[PDB]
Amino acid sequence: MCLKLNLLDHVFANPFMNAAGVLCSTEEDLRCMTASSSGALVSKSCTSAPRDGNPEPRYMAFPLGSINSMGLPNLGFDFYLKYASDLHDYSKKPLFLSISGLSVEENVAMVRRLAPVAQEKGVLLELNLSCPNVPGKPQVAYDFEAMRTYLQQVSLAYGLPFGVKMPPYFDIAHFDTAAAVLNEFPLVKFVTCVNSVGNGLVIDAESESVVIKPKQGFGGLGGKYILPTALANVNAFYRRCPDKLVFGCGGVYSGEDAFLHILAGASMVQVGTALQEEGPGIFTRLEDELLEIMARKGYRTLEEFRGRVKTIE
Amino acid sequence: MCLKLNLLDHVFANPFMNAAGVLCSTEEDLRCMTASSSGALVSKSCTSAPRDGNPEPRYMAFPLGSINSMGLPNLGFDFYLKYASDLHDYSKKPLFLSISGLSVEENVAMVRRLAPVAQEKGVLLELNLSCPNVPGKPQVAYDFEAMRTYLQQVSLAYGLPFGVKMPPYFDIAHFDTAAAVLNEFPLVKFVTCVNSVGNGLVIDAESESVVIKPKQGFGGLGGKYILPTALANVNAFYRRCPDKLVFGCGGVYSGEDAFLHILAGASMVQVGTALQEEGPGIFTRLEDELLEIMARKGYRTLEEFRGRVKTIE
Numbered sequence: 278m279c280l281k282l283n284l285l286d287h288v289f290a291n292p293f294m295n296a297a298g299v300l301c302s303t304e305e306d307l308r309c310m311t312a313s314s315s316g317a318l319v320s321k322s323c324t325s326a327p328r329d330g331n332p333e334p335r336y337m338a339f340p341l342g343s344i345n346s347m348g349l350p351n352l353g354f355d356f357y358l359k360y361a362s363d364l365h366d367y368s369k370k371p372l373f374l375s376i377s378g379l380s381v382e383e384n385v386a387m388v389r390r391l392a393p394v395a396q397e398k399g400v401l402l403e404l405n406l407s408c409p410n411v412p413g414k415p416q417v418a419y420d421f422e423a424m425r426t427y428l429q430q431v432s433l434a435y436g437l438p439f440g441v442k443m444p445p446y447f448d449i450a451h452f453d454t455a456a457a458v459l460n461e462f463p464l465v466k467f468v469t470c471v472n473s474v475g476n477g478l479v480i481d482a483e484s485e486s487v488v489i490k491p492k493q494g495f496g497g498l499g500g501k502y503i504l505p506t507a508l509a510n511v512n513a514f515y516r517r518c519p520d521k522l523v524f525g526c527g528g529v530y531s532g533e534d535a536f537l538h539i540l541a542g543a544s545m546v547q548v549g550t551a552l553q554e555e556g557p558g559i560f561t562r563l564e565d566e567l568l569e570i571m572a573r574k575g576y577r578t579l580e581e582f583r584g585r586v587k588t589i590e
Numbered sequence: 591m592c593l594k595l596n597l598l599d600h601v602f603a604n605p606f607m608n609a610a611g612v613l614c615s616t617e618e619d620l621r622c623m624t625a626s627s628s629g630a631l632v633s634k635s636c637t638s639a640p641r642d643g644n645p646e647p648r649y650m651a652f653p654l655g656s657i658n659s660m661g662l663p664n665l666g667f668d669f670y671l672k673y674a675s676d677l678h679d680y681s682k683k684p685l686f687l688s689i690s691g692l693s694v695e696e697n698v699a700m701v702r703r704l705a706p707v708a709q710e711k712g713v714l715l716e717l718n719l720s721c722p723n724v725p726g727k728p729q730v731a732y733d734f735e736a737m738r739t740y741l742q743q744v745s746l747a748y749g750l751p752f753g754v755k756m757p758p759y760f761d762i763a764h765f766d767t768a769a770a771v772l773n774e775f776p777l778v779k780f781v782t783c784v785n786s787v788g789n790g791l792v793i794d795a796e797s798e799s800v801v802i803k804p805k806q807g808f809g810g811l812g813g814k815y816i817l818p819t820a821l822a823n824v825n826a827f828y829r830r831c832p833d834k835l836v837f838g839c840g841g842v843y844s845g846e847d848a849f850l851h852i853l854a855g856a857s858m859v860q861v862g863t864a865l866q867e868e869g870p871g872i873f874t875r876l877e878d879e880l881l882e883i884m885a886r887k888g889y890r891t892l893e894e895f896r897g898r899v900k901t902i903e
């Protein structure tokens with residue numbers, strides 16, 4: 278009957294927050310997410326300098342979900358750090374800051390500056406391993422040695438508990454390798470599964486055209502298309518990383534979808550496409566709907582069912 | 591107006607066929623696919639010996655698609671070779687035979703034996719590369735060195751044009767690398783994109799349980815979930831393999847979905863989940879619906895629009 282929880286030395290009114298990138302780029306957006314009923318908020322992944330991002334149109338949504346190739350538009354790390362150190366009202370809810378530098382050095386340079394603000398104000402770091410395509414090498418989370426370098430360097434530079442935003446994997450050996458990398462780093466205290474399902478292509482039959490301008494129409498998919506992919510990643514890393522938290526992201530449109538993420542192992546549940554489409558009112562509905570399912574089942578706490586998805590035999 | 595194609599030295603009344611695995615395991619199944627209005631059929635991916643596959647339930651479907659961990663149940667190579675050599679009526683439509691040996695040596699042994707029947711009767715080989723190799727390693731087509739080995743060995747042992755069935759990829763680096771491997775092999779004349787989107791997890795909220803028994807509920811996804819992933823892969827290989835055909839598979843439930851595949855580059859268009867759910871009557875419906883879109887647009891043949899998806903500016 279209340280959905281409050283405690284994680285990472287912080288108190289949360291409920292497990293919901295925006296997904297990085299959605300409703301979180303400008304001061305106005307971050308004030309809007311803080312005024313909402315969400316339990317937390319995360320800022321737009323940032324780079325050391327500001328970015329315009331890719332040409333428009335760069336996001337489109339449809340009944341089954343969304344496609345985007347935003348290009349990491351952001352107001353620059355100095356802005357997000359300033360929001361964290363001077364503007365955010367911590368009495369309202371916790372703040373996560375997402376960083377997405379284009380090299381290890383850039384990520385290390387941002388985290389060294391974020392550390393004392395984390396100590397003083399309690400902002401939390403979500404390190405985004407996804408990045409614009411560089412011909413000739415894979416995304417960082419898809420190159421396990423690069424991933425290990427990033428986490429070794431960030432962990433050294435930051436020195437405090439943080440989390441990592443992961444793209445989906447689709448192969449059980451990949452789950453085993455990625456979770457073994459993550460388990461080398463004791464400061465990685467949460468894993469957020471998942472970022473968009475990479476490089477889909479939506480085509481409009483009437484116009485015979487792709488629907489976004491960058492990358493010949495290819496972009497990451499979110500929303501209903503990706504819920505079972507998201508639940509599989511959440512559960513695969515919940516099972517493999519027993520000393521970490523898993524934050525679930527992907528496909529959440531209802532309190533039933535949140536319930537499924539929590540059954541698979543999610544501690545917080547992030548909302549991307551559905552929030553972009555419905556606006557911040559969605560958080561009161563998701564809370565009501567999750568409490569309604571809990572009540573029908575007799576559950577009084579999230580702990581009673583987190584990670585307790587049943588297998589057959 | 592017409593749906594006819596002539597490719598790989600065969601004539602097809604229309605581009606539709608089953609996806610491997612669906613309606614194609616027994617003699618009864620293959621006679622049913624032959625009696626349908628599809629333009630071709632493919633047999634179930636086989637191994638040297640018969641397999642019972644995994645325990646049930648191992649396939650389930652829902653409004654947005656399906657999940658399966660079948661375990662490669664099949665009647666064994668000798669049965670499908672007999673069907674191709676002695677039973678199929680080639681005056682009705684062309685036959686593809688899919689193989690999925692559990693090692694390069696098993697595939698080599700099958701294709702050596704298939705070769706003389708392919709030469710005499712015109713059966714076409716589809717080699718499934720989205721298939722287990724050594725457990726704890728990724729599936730073959732996610733291990734580029736293994737994939738190259740499989741292709742070198744099968745190309746030497748078989749010596750005739752064949753095609754390959756590919757898992758989806760999600761990273762531009764992988765589209766680049768995979769297409770470069772395929773383009774090393776001139777006998778690979780068609781590339782079928784895509785197999786299921788691997789290791790998703792469907793969870794039923796009422797029962798709090800996964801819905802298939804093997805693999806703790808993890809399985810490959812088909813259907814509406816995967817259409818933009820399928821289209822991205824069809825187009826990515828269509829652009830990168832200009833000397834090969836691309837066949838599309840994933841998410842086809844209507845003539846409009848088939849039209850989008852074909853705009854992305856697809857020659858043949860395969861139907862898995864929707865055919866499993868609706869039965870072979872789907873082919874008359876897909877042909878009617880694709881001809882209606884062609885009529886409205888004034889297209890008289892498939893080559894007028896195949897691969898002609900527009901990009902923005």
Ligand SMILES: Cc1cc2nc3c(=O)[nH]c(=O)nc-3n(C[C@H](O)[C@H](O)[C@H](O)COP(=O)(O)O)c2cc1C
Nearest residue numbers: 296297298322471472473499500527528548549550
């Ligand atoms: C418009 C847009 C911008 C996004 N930007 C980011 C980002 O800056 N950093 C990040 O970690 N993920 C980003 N994402 C990914 C989302 O955080 C989320 O992982 C993905 O959309 C899946 O969740 P959903 O199904 O709720 O949309 C973005 C997604 C969208 C739709």
Ligand SMILES: Cc1cc2nc3c(=O)[nH]c(=O)nc-3n(C[C@H](O)[C@H](O)[C@H](O)COP(=O)(O)O)c2cc1C
Nearest residue numbers: 609610611635784785786812813840841861862863
């Ligand atoms: C029950 C079932 C069995 C399958 N078995 C095979 C197989 O033996 N070989 C293979 O190449 N693909 C197999 N697949 C994958 C399908 O061929 C197809 O690639 C996938 O289902 C996506 O197409 P769809 O969205 O139309 O279902 C199977 C799919 C299903 C649902």
Ligand SMILES: O=C(O)c1[nH]c(=O)[nH]c(=O)c1CCc1ccccc1
Nearest residue numbers: 346347348349350407408409473497
């Ligand atoms: O800003 C984006 O395009 C973006 N969109 C996503 O769905 N997830 C992300 O993490 C990002 C920022 C990193 C990124 C990823 C792919 C292409 C460009 C930037």
Ligand SMILES: O=C(O)c1[nH]c(=O)[nH]c(=O)c1CCc1ccccc1
Nearest residue numbers: 659660661662663720721722786810
């Ligand atoms: O028989 C299968 O489970 C199967 N299902 C698919 O959706 N696609 C396939 O290619 C196969 C056969 C290969 C496979 C894949 C994963 C585990 C075992 C066999």
